[PDB]
Amino acid sequence: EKQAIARQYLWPKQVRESGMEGRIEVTDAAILRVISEYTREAGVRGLERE
Amino acid sequence: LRKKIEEVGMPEAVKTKALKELDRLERMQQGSPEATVARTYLDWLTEVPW
Amino acid sequence: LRKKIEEVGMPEAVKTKALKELDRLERMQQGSPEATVARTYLDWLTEVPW
Amino acid sequence: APILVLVGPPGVGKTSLGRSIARSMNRKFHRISLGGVRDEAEIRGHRRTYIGAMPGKLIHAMKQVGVINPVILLDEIDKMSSDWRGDPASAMLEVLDPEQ
Amino acid sequence: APILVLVGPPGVGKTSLGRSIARSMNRKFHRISLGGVRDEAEIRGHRRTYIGAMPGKLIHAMKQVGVINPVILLDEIDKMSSDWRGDPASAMLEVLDPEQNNTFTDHYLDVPYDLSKVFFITTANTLQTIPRPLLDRMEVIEIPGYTNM
Ligand SMILES: Nc1ncnc2c1ncn2[C@@H]1O[C@H](COP(=O)(O)OP(=O)(O)OP(O)(O)=S)[C@@H](O)[C@H]1O
């Protein structure tokens, strides 16, 4: 669920608000590594800050 | 304000209260430490949705 | 004070609220202890930045 | 109309569902932030004998919204404070009573 | 704008770093010291129906600064009480919420006020005395402590 949320809602918003507009992109294994090794939460604010 | 009282809403036990208060307000001196209380109360009665 | 409400800012809802408050203030006798509290409030609304 | 409480951990979208549910049903929306509120005169008002009196947050919220069926979010209802002096959680019993 | 928290032992430069950050970016600065702040009526205000009523620290701080994007240092955020008498840590959830603080509502001003352009920097000695919903809104930057070199 966190991986689907980060693909559909969180990563496009952080991309749009930074000025990068198709210049940078993450894979799915990258999102899974950010979730599993950089976060201990139940929500999605820490994932959004990463 | 008379037209506003008898157009929006309102229940009859509140409408009688409001018309009695307006009939008091029509006797007071335009002024007044006691007319502004009545007019502010009638504005709150006519602007809340019924 | 009406000129100051017109110049700085402000959003349309808070500007409408401030103009209704000023129209209430114009028709009550000055030096009343409610004309003071209806005036300090408009000073605070016109002195914060918008 | 329903009366709901949404319970969960911090980062889950509890507050964010208010505007989504209100936008989905074409209803008006308003938000009242509780939490730390200790004054009972925020729920009800003062008796308009007093000198700058005006009604509580609920009548003000119904006046901002134009209609009689809005969606009103009451945010952080478990963070009100109740003790000998200051008890707004006892005035909220009258606004959330499902039949009174 | 960001909402940061700087956490570290005493004597490392946390309080003095806020003024340097605000000076390097040519932006206005203001401090609010939250140590020992005990009542909720200093975050929000009182209604304008009590006789000596006036807004809280945030609206007053936004009045002192003239602009809508200052740097505001909220100093000693972990030394803020939640006892019997007052709970200002639950009134801070409305201020530091990164998605909802464009409609912050003071009790004196009955209108929503936009606090989404302000650069908040908060400082603390440890993270363990911060409430968990309030810690989850802030980004941690850890200041470790110096070596001999
Ligand atoms: N299922 C989801 N899909 C998309 N975005 C989500 C989802 N769950 C949470 N979010 C996002 O997560 C962020 C945090 O949501 P909030 O509702 O503010 O959390 P919160 O539970 O209200 O926080 P507190 O501490 O309990 S008030 C928002 O930007 C939401 O859009």
Backbone angles phi, psi at D43, to 5 degrees: -85, -50
The kind and range of the H/E element at D61 are helix D57-64
The 3-state DSSP composition of chain D as helix, strand, coil percent (nearest 5) reads 20, 10, 70
Q: Test B44 with D55 for CB contact under 8 angstroms.
A: yes
Question: What angle, rounded to 10 degrees, do the helices at C37-47 and E57-64 form?
Answer: 60
Q: Taking CB atoms and an 8 Å cutoff, what residues of chain A touch D10?
A: 42-43, 45
Which candidate, E2, E13, E58, places its Cα nearest to that of E31? E58
Contact A9, A3 (CB under 8 A): no
Tokens of B33: 């430490």
Q: Taking CB atoms and an 8 Å cutoff, what residues of chain B touch C34?
A: 33, 36
Chain centre distance of CA B45 = 7
Decide whether any atom of ligand 1 lies within 6 Å of the E132 Cβ.
no
B40 burial level (CB within 10 Å; 0-12, 13-18, 19+)? middle
What is d(CA A22, CA D39) in angstroms, rounded to the nearest whole number?
51
Q: E73: helix, coil or strand?
A: strand
For an interface test with C, which of B29, B36, B41, B44 has the most C Cβ atoms less than 10 Å from its Cβ?
B36
Contact E49, D51 (CB under 8 A): yes
* CATH entry, E1-142, from 3.40.50.300, 3.30.200.20, 1.10.10.10, 3.30.1300.30: 3.40.50.300
Chain D 8-47, CB below 8 Å of chain A: which residues?
A: 8-12
CA distances from C1 to C45, D53, E63 (A): 11, 24, 18
Decide whether any atom of ligand 1 lies within 6 Å of the A13 Cβ.
no
Q: Which residues contact E78 (CB under 8 A, 6 or more apart)?
A: E124, E125, E126, E127, E129, E130
A2 is in an annotated binding site: no
Q: Which residue of C has its CA nearest to D50?
A: C34
Contact E132, E90 (CB under 8 A): no
Q: D2: helix, coil or strand?
A: coil
Residue indicated by tokens 């009665």: B45
Chain centre distance of CA D15 = 13
What is d(CA B27, CA E65) in angstroms, rounded to the nearest whole number?
49
Q: Which residues contact A34 (CB under 8 A, 6 or more apart)?
A: A6, A47, A50
Residue E67 identity: V
The length of chain B is: 50
Contact D21, D70 (CB under 8 A): no
Contact E68, C49 (CB under 8 A): yes
What is d(CA B34, CA D8) in angstroms, rounded to the nearest whole number?
51
Contact D57, D95 (CB under 8 A): no
Contact E96, E58 (CB under 8 A): no
Quote the DSSP letter at residue D73.
Answer: E
Tell whether D4 lies on the interface with C, counting CB pairs under 8 A: no
Decide whether any atom of ligand 1 lies within 6 Å of the D10 Cβ.
yes
Residue D10 identity: P
Quote the DSSP letter at residue A9.
Answer: I
CA of E34 to the centre of ligand 1 (A): 28
Method of determination is cryo-EM
What is d(CA E2, CA E122) in angstroms, rounded to the nearest whole number?
11
